[PDB]
Amino acid sequence: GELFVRPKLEEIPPADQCRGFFGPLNDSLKFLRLLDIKWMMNR
Amino acid sequence: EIQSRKKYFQTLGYLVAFIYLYFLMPKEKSFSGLSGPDGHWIMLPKGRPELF
Amino acid sequence: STVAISVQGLHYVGTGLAAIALAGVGLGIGTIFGNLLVACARQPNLTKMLFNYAILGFALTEAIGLFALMLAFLMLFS
Amino acid sequence: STVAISVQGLHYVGTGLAAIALAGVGLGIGTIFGNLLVACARQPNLTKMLFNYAILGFALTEAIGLFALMLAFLMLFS
Amino acid sequence: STVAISVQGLHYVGTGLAAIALAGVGLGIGTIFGNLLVACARQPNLTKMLFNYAILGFALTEAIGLFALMLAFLMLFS
Amino acid sequence: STVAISVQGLHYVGTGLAAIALAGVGLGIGTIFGNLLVACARQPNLTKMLFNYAILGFALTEAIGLFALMLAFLMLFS
Amino acid sequence: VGNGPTFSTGGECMNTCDIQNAFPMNDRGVRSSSP
Amino acid sequence: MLLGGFVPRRFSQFNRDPCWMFFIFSVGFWLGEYPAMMIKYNARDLVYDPHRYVWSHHDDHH
Amino acid sequence: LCNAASKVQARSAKKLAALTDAGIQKTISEHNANGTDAAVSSTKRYLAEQRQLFHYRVVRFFDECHYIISGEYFAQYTKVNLIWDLRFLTKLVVLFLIGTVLGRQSIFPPIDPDSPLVEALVTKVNPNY
Amino acid sequence: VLFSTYRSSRLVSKEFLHGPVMRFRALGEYYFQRAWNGTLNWALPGEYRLYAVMIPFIYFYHRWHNDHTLDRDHVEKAMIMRWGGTLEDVRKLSAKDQLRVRCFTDIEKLYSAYGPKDTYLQPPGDTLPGKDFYR
Amino acid sequence: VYTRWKCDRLPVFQLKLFTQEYPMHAAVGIFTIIFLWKHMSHCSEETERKYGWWAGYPYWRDPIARRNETKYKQMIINNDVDITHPKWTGCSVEQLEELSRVV
Amino acid sequence: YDHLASWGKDAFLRRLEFENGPLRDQVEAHTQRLLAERAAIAK
Amino acid sequence: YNMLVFRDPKRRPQLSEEERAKVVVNQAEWPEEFKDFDPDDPYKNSPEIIKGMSSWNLFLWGVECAFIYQFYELVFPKSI
Amino acid sequence: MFLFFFCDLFWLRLLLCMYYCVWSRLCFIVYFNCLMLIFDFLLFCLFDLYLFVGLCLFLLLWFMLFNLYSLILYYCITYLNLYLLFCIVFLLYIAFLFLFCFLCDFFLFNNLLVGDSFMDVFFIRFLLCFLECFSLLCRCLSTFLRLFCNLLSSHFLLLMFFDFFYFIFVFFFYGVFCYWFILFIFVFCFCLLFYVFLYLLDLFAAILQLFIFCNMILQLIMDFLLFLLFV
Amino acid sequence: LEPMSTWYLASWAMVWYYAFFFWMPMVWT
Amino acid sequence: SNPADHFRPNLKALTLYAERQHYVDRWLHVKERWLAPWYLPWWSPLFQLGTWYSQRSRNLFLVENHLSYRPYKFRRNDEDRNNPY
Ligand SMILES: CCCCCCCCCCCCCCCCCC(=O)OC[C@H](COP(=O)([O-])OCC(O)COP(=O)([O-])OC[C@@H](COC(=O)CCCCCCCCCCCCCCCCC)OC(=O)CCCCCCCCCCCCCCCCC)OC(=O)CCCCCCCCCCCCCCCCC
Ligand SMILES: CCCCCCCCCCCCCCCCCC(=O)OC[C@H](COP(=O)([O-])OCC(O)COP(=O)([O-])OC[C@@H](COC(=O)CCCCCCCCCCCCCCCCC)OC(=O)CCCCCCCCCCCCCCCCC)OC(=O)CCCCCCCCCCCCCCCCC
Ligand SMILES: CCCCCCCCCCCCCCCCCC(=O)OC[C@H](COP(=O)([O-])OCC(O)COP(=O)([O-])OC[C@@H](COC(=O)CCCCCCCCCCCCCCCCC)OC(=O)CCCCCCCCCCCCCCCCC)OC(=O)CCCCCCCCCCCCCCCCC
Ligand SMILES: CCCCCCCCCCCCCCCCCC(=O)OC[C@H](COP(=O)([O-])OCC(O)COP(=O)([O-])OC[C@@H](COC(=O)CCCCCCCCCCCCCCCCC)OC(=O)CCCCCCCCCCCCCCCCC)OC(=O)CCCCCCCCCCCCCCCCC
Ligand SMILES: CCCCCCCCCCCCCCCCCC(=O)OC[C@H](COP(=O)([O-])OCC[N+](C)(C)C)OC(=O)CCCCCCCCCCCCCCCCC
Ligand SMILES: CCCCCCCCCCCCCCCCCC(=O)OC[C@H](COP(=O)([O-])OCC[N+](C)(C)C)OC(=O)CCCCCCCCCCCCCCCCC
Ligand SMILES: CCCCCCCC/C=C/CCCCCCCC(=O)OC[C@H](COP(=O)(O)OCCN)OC(=O)CCCCCCC/C=C/CCCCCCCC
């Protein structure tokens, strides 16, 4: 529809804010980000 | 000029084709076999005894 | 085994089903004229253009009903 | 036992069922024109434009009926 | 005792029943376009936008019919 | 006496009857989008939210249609 | 006068076409069928 | 597009243009072939084929 | 039953008044004044003229035969004459076919006793026809 | 270098067959190059007389082809199947008999789905030959 | 001035049209042609009998059998095939002669 | 367009020349007067 | 007027009533084909393409051709 | 198997050669929207958005030469086959789709993921993306199916009605000389009315179906066009 | 129905492919 | 049935038959004849275009190990569902 402008480096939220199937995969669970498809979709 | 001559010849050719198609050309594979071909095989091997 | 059966009266059944296709055709025509009246009440000066469009709608709906009726009469004579 | 039975008349029944689809199509077309009238009496300056869209709608809606009708023919001629 | 019967002509009935589903699709499309005609007469300036959404609905309403249509073939050619 | 009859062509009828369920899903989607068009003209400033809600409703109706298709395919194969 | 054709029009009315300004208008108010 | 051309006002004027002359000839053929079929196919001496039950298209396509 | 008759009479009267032929109007007025029938008078005049022109037709036939036989007709042959001759040939063919059908008093040729179609004659639904 | 890619490389003179070509163009232009001959996507002209001439001609030649090339096959099949199953058997009949048979086929065509069904369904008790007559 | 449609000859314009104007469409069309001739270019004898004839298959002369007979005769004569070979018959020549004398 | 000269003018072409020729004003006046008279008679 | 779907074109007036009223009609200058010109019947006095060839004659010619087409085989049948 | 046959356009080809040896203006086009994609001025597209005009015009001419003239009795629609129409629509639709895909711009497909960030990505948005990707192919299939079915149904109906009219006209016209002549005249008038109505309906439907056939393709193209604003 | 058939689909489609690849350029020019 | 028969091409002229084996072999002979000369090295794109895809497809056919039976492509009768032979 309309033109798409890529976000700036400062406009991209941090990875820790993203949520997985059950909950955020923060520290001690970072390596589970690779396996969680929903977390990757949200990211 | 070029297109006029080309279309004149094309018109004559199409006229001949139309007459032949709709008044002379028989339909293939007739039930009685009095008109049209029944089909035949092509590209059959020749002079290749080792093939069989 | 290889049994085979032909039934005669079945063409009465299918024909009847096709007649049901005229239920929504009937209705539909109804609906058009319904709306037409309201339109002629809302804009009474447009009593002819609206009539023409209603006739067009009836003609198309009647064509559909006629498509169905062809089957209904054809199965009844098969 | 094990019998391979082939009934012939069933192709009528199915055919009739397909015609029932038209009951919707027909009705649907009517609905369009219904609204068309209510739309022409609400803003006549757009009548022509509206008419065009209606025709588009009719052509899309009718298309569906044809599908059903095709099936009927397929079963009626087989 | 155990008797196994294989009727060959029953797929016509299932095909016709599947085709019946197209009535709802046709009616839905008619409703969409009727509402479109009414809406455009109310907010003409945005007509184009409305049209797009209408088409979207058609794209999301015809697809369903295809599935039904699909089943018909899967039973009509089998 | 006791007869254990197994007819091989009855799943087509069940598949068609299940497929009939899509006549409601299609009409529901049509109603959703018709109301969406009517609402956008009424309050065009909220087009995106209305579009999102209509998409949600379509997804739910499509889920119902998916359940119906699951039953239809299960009967068609099993 | 002869029976020959003239500048093609395509069956269009130049008094209401999208390029009507390209067709000169005469005293009677009828736009020409040609440049 | 049906924009214009010679249009006869009535039957008697179809002979004022060669194209409409051909048209009225064709219309004569079209409408007059039906009476001929009435006479030919409703004739007293027309007899059905005795062997009409030996074969029919209905058994062939079935 | 009476309104329809009045309407038909009125329509025909309007059409009769509409025509702008001086001779037709004059004859109609004269016959209306005298109370006679114009159409029947026209028919009688026509038949009288044709009765008095029979030998004119014979003389014309012989003159035309001489014109054709002498070759003068083909000397000035044009496309229009070709069109007329094609029309003439078509009428001749159609008349020959109609004459054959009437001569045998049957649309189709009669069936011979040795033909296998005799059964069809025997199995007529209605022997009267 | 062998053949030119440009249409300007003429193969004949400008005056080659000028007369016949001009007559052909006169035939084309007289009715078509007119203001009222505005076509719809080049397929439907505006001149009425083009319809009046071309619809009958198209129908005529299509009908001749259908009658003498397409339906003739069905007619011959009916004649062969109903009167021996072989071409020689049909040729054993006279022209009048063949005429009768072909006209009965025409009757069947005109009835189609609305005529009486006794033309192909043998009523019980009928004395005429059946399907196993030649078998 | 130069234009492709007016100055180039027809074959040249055809190549230009389908190479610098509609190359993807030409590619897809060629793809579809290959698919059709790879998967939709065969018809069995039974299929021909069912649907391959305008008025129906004339069993009373069986033209398919005649066509195949001509084909096989031509192949045998041209390729010098010994149809009496044991692989074709499944038995030795002497056994074939014995069978001929028997029947 | 000399090659068309032999074809002459058909009835429709003659009518168009008559109505749109130098006598166009007279034909327009006569036609409009006749139509007005017929309309008055109809009413 | 109409003949089936073929409608006779009508020229739009170009003169105003004031200018039109000042026009003097002189039918002596008109061609013999168009005298007492009637928009509802402009070709009443138009000449026939072929003298003596009526429309009914052509219609009958077509009817006769149809009769020949249907009846020739009844008189001159041919074998298969 | 190689079947040699010919199309039913040879006379029309002859007429085209005769009547188009000289130039003529075209002012009426069945699908005019292929020429006017942009309605707001100062908007322009870097994509070749007018590439479809030539194919559209040729397709309209071809389909019109076949479908419109098929109303004449015994005229044959040579291409009337389901899979052949599938091939035609496949060519056009997939060619344009591959033109957009060869662009190697993945952001062009961002709009396939329907909805906003509020909606759950896996259970709502991704299923909508699946349905939309399915809907593209379904649009292709529906286009070709709709073109095939309209012709087939219309001509079947015409054939059946013509057969009925022939039957009653030939085998029941004698009632004109009988005491039940009024019934036959009523039926005959009804048949004439039905004849005219069917012919008008078919004439309108053929053109409308060509319009929609071209509109589907143009809609495919328009779904992926992006317009820049002149400054 | 031949419209639903495939036993000579390739030869049948050759008509469309010839129209597209050989006749369209002529109509174009 | 009869109405359905009206939707057939009306200008069928000739039908030719050819075995897949025969014309495939002839095509291979043509390809070998044109790709044989020394002035077309095996590493040229033209030669690889001619040969590699065909080799790959034939290899895929040879490697195939299917648990089901695929009936012969060119049987005399392929209309009977209950007879793959
Ligand atoms: C198998 C073999 C069998 C063989 C059997 C034997 C064969 C015969 C052998 C000889 C026998 C002895 C001789 C007997 C001779 C009798 C005839 C005779 O002399 O005639 C002269 C006589 C006039 O003589 P006259 O009185 O001295 O005249 C003085 C002047 O000369 C007057 O001059 P004129 O200027 O008036 O000249 C014109 C005049 C003279 O024209 C003629 O001479 C005509 C031709 C004469 C011969 C006719 C023979 C008829 C025999 C039966 C039919 C055979 C086919 C005839 C074909 C004729 C084609 C034109 O025209 C007429 O006569 C017109 C008649 C038709 C009138 C039409 C009006 C219809 C109105 C309907 C309205 C309905 C409204 C209902 C509303 C209801 C509301 C609830 O005319 C007639 O008798 C006319 C008879 C016409 C009968 C037609 C019947 C047709 C069949 C029924 C109709 C079916 C279709 C339509 C149905 C529609 C639904 C309702
Ligand atoms: C400065 C020198 C002055 C000399 C003065 C001389 C004056 C006196 C006259 C001289 C003598 C006459 C000269 C010829 C006149 C020709 C007619 C004429 O005037 O035309 C107008 C015009 C006059 O020239 P121009 O206007 O001055 O200049 C033309 C422009 O420069 C460029 O034109 P363009 O590019 O715009 O268009 C050319 C062409 C487009 O270009 C081409 O077509 C050329 C390429 C075509 C190739 C087709 C074959 C491909 C096969 C596949 C590949 C095979 C590869 C094999 C490899 C090796 C294998 C070992 O356009 C067309 O196709 C449309 C026109 C078609 C004409 C109609 C043809 C049929 C008429 C039938 C009438 C009779 C009916 C039957 C009557 C029966 C009665 C009972 O001529 C042309 O347009 C040329 C047409 C050429 C068509 C060739 C078609 C050949 C088809 C048969 C092939 C047979 C192969 C057999 C193989 C067997 C193996 C076993
Ligand atoms: C000397 C010529 C060059 C020699 C070779 C040079 C070196 C190699 C060149 C490149 C080779 C490519 C190899 C394959 C690459 C990948 C594609 C693929 O899968 O291919 C499958 C297969 C090749 O098989 P393969 O993979 O090599 O392995 C064999 C397998 O065992 C087979 O397994 P299968 O199951 O796939 O087998 C089924 C069947 C499957 O076969 C097919 O599906 C055949 C499809 C043919 C496609 C043609 C493409 C061009 C179309 C142009 C537009 C036409 C529009 C429609 C016109 C209709 C009316 C004519 O395969 C065959 O039997 C292959 C036979 C191929 C014969 C090609 C003959 C072309 C004739 C063109 C006629 C044009 C007439 C225009 C007249 C106009 C006049 C104005 O088919 C093709 O590759 C077809 C395209 C071949 C193009 C060759 C080069 C251009 C044409 C040169 C000859 C021109 C003759 C003109 C005669 C004019 C008479 C008037
Ligand atoms: C074994 C028996 C024989 C058969 C062998 C066959 C071998 C097959 C090999 C295997 C092939 C496998 C694949 C087959 C796939 C088929 C698919 C198919 O048919 O699709 C439908 C599809 C239908 O297309 P369409 O829409 O009807 O349009 C194509 C038309 O051609 C119309 O389209 P268009 O109008 O757009 O075309 C352009 C047209 C533009 O318009 C024109 O140029 C007008 C003329 C049109 C001609 C073409 C139409 C033909 C009409 C019917 C036949 C006419 C009468 C023939 C009389 C025969 C009498 C026995 O220009 C031309 O046609 C250029 C050629 C002009 C030739 C002019 C010759 C003049 C000679 C003058 C000589 C004067 C001598 C004087 C001496 C004086 C001495 C004192 O067909 C095609 O697309 C073409 C398929 C061709 C595939 C290639 C076949 C291989 C080549 C075979 C050539 C055989 C030559 C030897 C025969 C000898 C007599 C027995
Ligand atoms: C833009 C809109 C165009 C609308 C055009 C409207 C045309 C109106 C025609 C009125 C009736 C014409 C009757 C013709 C009779 C011919 C003789 C005959 O027997 O026919 C009977 C035939 C068939 O009649 P039938 O079915 O009763 O035949 C009986 C025959 N038996 C019993 C053996 C079966 O009539 C027709 O089929 C006529 C239908 C015409 C429908 C309109 C077609 C329009 C599309 C083609 C346009 C062509 C223009 C080409 C111009 C050049 C292009 C470059
Ligand atoms: C009565 C029954 C009725 C059934 C009806 C069924 C529907 C029929 C519909 C027919 C009409 C519609 C057809 C639309 C088009 C369909 C297209 C299709 O699916 O075709 C697929 C088919 C697949 O081809 P294939 O079938 O040969 O696949 C080979 C795969 N093996 C070897 C494992 C068997 O495509 C073709 O037929 C064309 C192939 C040649 C052209 C492409 C070559 C390049 C390939 C690139 C990848 C691989 C090589 C490496 C890269 C390149 C290196 C140089
Ligand atoms: C390139 C050939 C090298 C070997 C020598 C071969 C000579 C053979 C004898 C030829 C005698 C007749 C020649 C007639 C004049 C030919 C002129 C010519 O080539 O015109 C091409 C002209 C096309 O013209 P345009 O495309 O418009 O463009 C032309 C200008 N750019 O083509 C034609 O019209 C066809 C003319 C064909 C003539 C004959 C050609 C024969 C070629 C044979 C080569 C093979 C070797 C032969 C050896 C023969 C030994 C006895």
Residue numbers in the entry:
A (entry chain k): 20 to 62
B (entry chain n): 105 to 156
C (entry chain O1), D (entry chain P1), E (entry chain Q1), F (entry chain R1): 41 to 118
G (entry chain n): 18 to 52
H (entry chain r): 1 to 62
I (entry chain m): 16 to 144
J (entry chain f): 2 to 136
K (entry chain i): 2 to 104
Could you pull the original sentences from the published paper?
Finally, particles with both monomers in rotational state 1 were selected, and the consensus structure of the dimer was refined to 3.2 Å resolution. Unlike the wide-angle architecture of dimers found in animals and fungi, the T. brucei ATP synthase displays an angle of 60° between the two F1/c-ring subcomplexes. Despite sharing a set of conserved Fo subunits, the T. brucei ATP synthase dimer displays a markedly different dimer architecture compared to previously determined structures. Second, unlike mammalian and fungal ATP synthase, in which the peripheral stalks extend in the plane defined by the two rotary axes, in our structure the monomers are rotated such that the peripheral stalks are offset laterally on the opposite sides of the plane. Due to the rotated monomers, this architecture is associated with a specific dimerization interface, where two subunit-g copies interact homotypically on the C2 symmetry axis. Both copies of H1-2g extend horizontally along the matrix side of the membrane, clamping against each other. Thus, the ATP synthase dimer is assembled via the subunit-e/g module.
Mitochondrial ATP synthase consists of the soluble F1 and membrane-bound Fo subcomplexes and occurs in dimers that assemble into oligomers to induce the formation of inner-membrane folds, called cristae. Dissociation of ATP synthase dimers into monomers results in the loss of native cristae architecture and impairs mitochondrial function. Here, we report cryo-EM structures of the intact ATP synthase dimer from Trypanosoma brucei in ten different rotational states. Although overall dimer architecture varies among eukaryotes, we find that subunit-g together with subunit-e form an ancestral oligomerization motif, which is shared between the trypanosomal and mammalian lineages.
